[PDB]
Amino acid sequence: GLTPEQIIAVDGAHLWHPYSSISPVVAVAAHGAWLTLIRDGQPIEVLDAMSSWWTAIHGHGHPALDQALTTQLRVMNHVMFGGLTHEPAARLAKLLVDITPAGLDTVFFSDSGSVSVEVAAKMALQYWRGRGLPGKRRLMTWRGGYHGDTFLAMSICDPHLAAQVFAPQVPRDYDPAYSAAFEAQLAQHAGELAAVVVEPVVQGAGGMRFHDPRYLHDLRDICRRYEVLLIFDEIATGFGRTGALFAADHAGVSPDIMCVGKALTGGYLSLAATLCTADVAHTISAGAAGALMHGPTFMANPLACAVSVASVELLLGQDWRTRITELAAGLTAGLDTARALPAVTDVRVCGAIGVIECDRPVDLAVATPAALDRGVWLRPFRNLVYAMPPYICTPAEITQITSAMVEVARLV
Amino acid sequence: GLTPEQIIAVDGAHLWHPYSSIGREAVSPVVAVAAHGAWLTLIRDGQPIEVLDAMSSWWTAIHGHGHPALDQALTTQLRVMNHVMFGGLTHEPAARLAKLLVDITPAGLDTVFFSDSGSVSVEVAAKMALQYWRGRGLPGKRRLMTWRGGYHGDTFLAMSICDPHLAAQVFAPQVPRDYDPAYSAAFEAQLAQHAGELAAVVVEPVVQGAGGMRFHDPRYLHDLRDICRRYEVLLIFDEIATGFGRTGALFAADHAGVSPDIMCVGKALTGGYLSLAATLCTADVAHTISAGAAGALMHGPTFMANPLACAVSVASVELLLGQDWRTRITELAAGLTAGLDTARALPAVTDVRVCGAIGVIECDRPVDLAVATPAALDRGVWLRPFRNLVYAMPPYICTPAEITQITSAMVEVARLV
Numbered sequence: 134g135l136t137p138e139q140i141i142a143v144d145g146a147h148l149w150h151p152y153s154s155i156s157p158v159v160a161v162a163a164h165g166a167w168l169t170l171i172r173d174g175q176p177i178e179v180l181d182a183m184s185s186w187w188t189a190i191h192g193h194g195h196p197a198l199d200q201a202l203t204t205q206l207r208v209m210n211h212v213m214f215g216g217l218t219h220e221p222a223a224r225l226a227k228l229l230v231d232i233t234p235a236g237l238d239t240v241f242f243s244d245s246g247s248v249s250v251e252v253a254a255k256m257a258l259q260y261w262r263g264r265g266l267p268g269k270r271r272l273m274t275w276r277g278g279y280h281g282d283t284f285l286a287m288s289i290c291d292p293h294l295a296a297q298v299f300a301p302q303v304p305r306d307y308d309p310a311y312s313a314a315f316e317a318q319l320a321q322h323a324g325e326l327a328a329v330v331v332e333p334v335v336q337g338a339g340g341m342r343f344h345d346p347r348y349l350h351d352l353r354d355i356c357r358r359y360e361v362l363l364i365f366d367e368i369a370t371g372f373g374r375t376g377a378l379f380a381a382d383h384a385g386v387s388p389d390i391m392c393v394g395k396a397l398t399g400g401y402l403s404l405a406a407t408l409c410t411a412d413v414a415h416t417i418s419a420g421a422a423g424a425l426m427h428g429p430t431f432m433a434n435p436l437a438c439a440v441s442v443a444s445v446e447l448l449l450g451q452d453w454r455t456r457i458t459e460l461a462a463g464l465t466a467g468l469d470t471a472r473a474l475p476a477v478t479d480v481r482v483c484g485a486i487g488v489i490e491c492d493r494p495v496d497l498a499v500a501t502p503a504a505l506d507r508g509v510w511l512r513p514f515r516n517l518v519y520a521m522p523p524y525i526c527t528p529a530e531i532t533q534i535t536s537a538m539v540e541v542a543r544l545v
Numbered sequence: 546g547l548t549p550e551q552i553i554a555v556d557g558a559h560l561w562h563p564y565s566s567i568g569r570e571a572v573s574p575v576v577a578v579a580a581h582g583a584w585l586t587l588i589r590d591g592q593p594i595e596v597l598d599a600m601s602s603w604w605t606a607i608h609g610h611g612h613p614a615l616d617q618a619l620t621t622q623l624r625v626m627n628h629v630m631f632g633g634l635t636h637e638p639a640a641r642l643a644k645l646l647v648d649i650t651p652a653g654l655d656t657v658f659f660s661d662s663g664s665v666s667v668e669v670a671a672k673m674a675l676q677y678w679r680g681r682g683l684p685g686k687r688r689l690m691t692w693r694g695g696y697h698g699d700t701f702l703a704m705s706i707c708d709p710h711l712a713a714q715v716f717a718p719q720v721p722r723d724y725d726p727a728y729s730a731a732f733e734a735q736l737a738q739h740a741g742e743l744a745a746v747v748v749e750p751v752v753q754g755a756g757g758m759r760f761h762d763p764r765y766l767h768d769l770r771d772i773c774r775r776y777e778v779l780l781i782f783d784e785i786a787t788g789f790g791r792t793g794a795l796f797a798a799d800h801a802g803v804s805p806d807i808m809c810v811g812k813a814l815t816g817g818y819l820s821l822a823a824t825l826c827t828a829d830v831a832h833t834i835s836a837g838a839a840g841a842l843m844h845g846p847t848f849m850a851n852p853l854a855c856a857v858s859v860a861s862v863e864l865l866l867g868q869d870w871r872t873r874i875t876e877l878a879a880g881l882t883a884g885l886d887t888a889r890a891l892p893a894v895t896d897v898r899v900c901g902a903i904g905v906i907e908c909d910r911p912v913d914l915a916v917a918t919p920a921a922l923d924r925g926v927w928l929r930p931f932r933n934l935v936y937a938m939p940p941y942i943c944t945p946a947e948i949t950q951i952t953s954a955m956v957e958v959a960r961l962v
């Protein structure tokens with residue numbers, strides 16, 4: 134065992150944190166929408182406004198998910214997915230194929246979002262090889278995107294590695310001229326392109342930007358006409374977050390390949406999935422390799438699959454759309470006051486996502502204590518103060534979150 | 546819920562398996578309904594049967610499945626904190642595991658980067674090496690060098706250093722089993738001409754797993770360490786398969802008594818409960834990266850340092866260290882040697898080799914799966930031959946009788962070949 138002080142000592146000496154060098158606050162518990170943190174030697178309750186980075190949609194320690202995990206743990210923790218299959222994987226695959234955009238009928242489980250993106254790339258590349266067009270090996274996307282930290286995933290992240298094709302930043306408002314320009318650029322690269330890869334509707338890590346769903350309809354059309362596969366990365370947007378079950382649903386379009394993760398497991402365990410159409414699967418399967426050449430050690434882990442099944446079932450068994458609509462209303466109302474702030478450039482809400490865009494990078498040394506002082510855990514990045522609250526947050530808790538966000542913006 | 550029939554129907558229509566097809570599988574997956582200790586419960590011809598997990602579910606299940614201590618560690622952490630973001634927050638599980646790993650790994654490795662899988666941990670190791678040299682003002686050192694027969698995962702960068710059989714990396718010849726100073730001299734010569742271009746050498750120490758279950762004299766690792774130091778190239782050991790006692794030492798590097806600059810671990814890390822991997826580096830590497838223009842290691846997965854995965858790993862590592870694991874492995878190695886001995890005389894058998902809790906029969910031809918599967922299943926053993934290899938890496942908890950059962954099944958496969 135270790136005291137909060139010993140943890141800090143070990144952490145400072147031995148632990149790499151995300152995108153950091155070699156001060157973290159000690160977290161000692163999580164329950165519902167609340168974290169227990171240690172501040173100045175004292176335990177404090179704070180709202181998990183970030184849902185622990187998009188994951189904890191049902192909050193922490195939900196009895197349904199806890200029990201799903203303990204139930205599976207009693208019977209089978211893990212077995213290899215080579216030559217074996219199991220109920221959690223089958224139940225989850227069945228669910229995912231049923232709730233995702235039409236045509237997505239096969240499921241490849243992996244351990245993280247970055248890996249699922251590379252699997253999606255593998256699918257697209259092997260697809261065209263299966264069609265006898267191995268020259269189609271590049272990827273195209275628009276600027277402002279983020280798809281993970283592995284080397285292939287890095288290649289399609291906003292440039293500001295494989296050399297990929299980048300269209301200009303997709304605007305918030307629909308402009309037919311943007312779609313026309315996108316098509317013209319894609320046209321001259323078509324013989325080079327395996328796929329277009331984008332985050333539908335919401336671009337997260339690249340700057341929490343929202344774009345009109347109509348752009349997705351245009352992409353589907355362009356890709357269809359120029360024979361380029363369309364890949365949607367819904368790792369952040371999936372499972373109700375943007376007001377629809379999957380962001381693609383706002384445009385009513387189905388991609389050829391789709392990545393999901395994060396909220397998939399309710400934030401309990403690492404799991405991701407890459408789905409593709411029957412056409413893609415068969416073409417790869419009929420190809421020279423005769424198979425999709427990927428398969429991680431812990432593929433389709435029974436424990437992760439079991440808790441994911443329960444998380445998805447919990448989500449579908451309630452009126453999630455109304456819940457999200459209520460959250461969106463709460464965020465909008467709560468953030469409105471920020472608009473008039475001198476350092477605030479924009480305020481925007483999309484489903485259970487709320488963003489205050491500031492005129493300068495937000496200083497964590499100031500924002501963090503300001504948020505903690507108000508009983509809220511916020512993690513600003515670049516010039517953004519934002520939140521993606523758990524779906525179980527009450528109106529009062531959303532108000533607490535938004536008022537903390539506003540006071541952070543005010544300090545900037 | 547689903548019946549085994551419904552599971553197979555769903556599986557066939559909607560599930561990708563590792564390196565497999567949809568609709569074109571010669572052999573359908575077998576339904577697994579339970580796992581406890583060294584045994585899996587599988588559905589054969591509709592009958593539930595118990596079979597030995599001879600592969601430890603790919604090196605992972607070192608304490609067997611559903612070990613009471615590990616189950617408890619998981620449920621204990623589940624009651625308090627399932628997960629929190631590792632950005633700006635830290636927690637006891639991560640700290641306890643980091644402290645443990647820093648203490649039991651080869652000397653010098655005192656920083657720990659957690660990731661969600663082996664392939665990712667390898668990519669992190671690569672990033673560390675590349676950023677290290679950028680921090681030294683030598684961005685030209687960006688390629689990797691390895692020897693053939695290796696395997697390091699299936700993300701695109703990981704693939705580039707896997708045995709060809711992508712970034713174009715530098716490949717030295719297959720390292721031989723027995724120590725030949727000539728091999729090391731030639732390795733040095735090849736590396737020497739690429740030095741200004743090389744960020745790191747990356748290899749599996751002592752045992753190459755997925756690349757063909759080959760063993761090599763640990764002295765080669767001593768040579769690599771020396772070569773790397775003299776030519777200013779970092780050394781990366783991928784111990785994702787060899788770690789935590791598997792080869793008869795706590796880490797395979799310990800056989801050679803050398804310390805890499807960077808090291809990857811995974812698999813047995815969590816006792817095979819959940820996916821978790823870690824990349825460790827020296828203080829020098831960490832400091833050089835932190836002092837560079839970038840000012841930080843530019844990597845950070847959403848689910849980094851998951852409390853549940855860390856908690857079960859702490860229990861698994863503590864369980865291993867709290868017992869005489871070295872003697873357990875020695876006993877396993879002896880049981881494997883005794884059990885596989887009779888295969889040495891089989892017509893189609895080219896080699897029989899054992900290293901710690903690893904047993905391999907190498908044939909002179911490819912192993913037909915349609916012959917091997919029912920043969921092993923009939924004998925209550927789950928085996929996964931590939932190419933010309935029939936092999937096992939059983940859980941450390943296997944009794945002498947279970948080892949006899951496993952080896953007897955392997956020999957029969959070798960006989961049928």
Ligand SMILES: Cc1ncc(COP(=O)(O)O)c(CNc2ccc(CCCO)[nH]c2=O)c1O
Nearest residue numbers: 245246247279280281337338368369514846847
């Ligand atoms: C769309 C999409 N595709 C792929 C991934 C990667 O999957 P992973 O391999 O499991 O990490 C992510 C998740 N990565 C991030 C999400 C959110 C932030 C916000 C805070 C930045 O400081 N930063 C991230 O890096 C994703 O959102």
Ligand SMILES: Cc1ncc(COP(=O)(O)O)c(CNc2ccc(CCCO)[nH]c2=O)c1O
Nearest residue numbers: 213214215429430563662663664697698785786
């Ligand atoms: C040394 C080493 N370094 C890195 C990795 C990659 O880490 P991952 O990303 O967690 O896979 C591995 C992976 N080992 C295997 C991977 C896949 C199967 C097939 C399983 C079929 O059910 N069997 C494996 O042994 C590895 O051995």
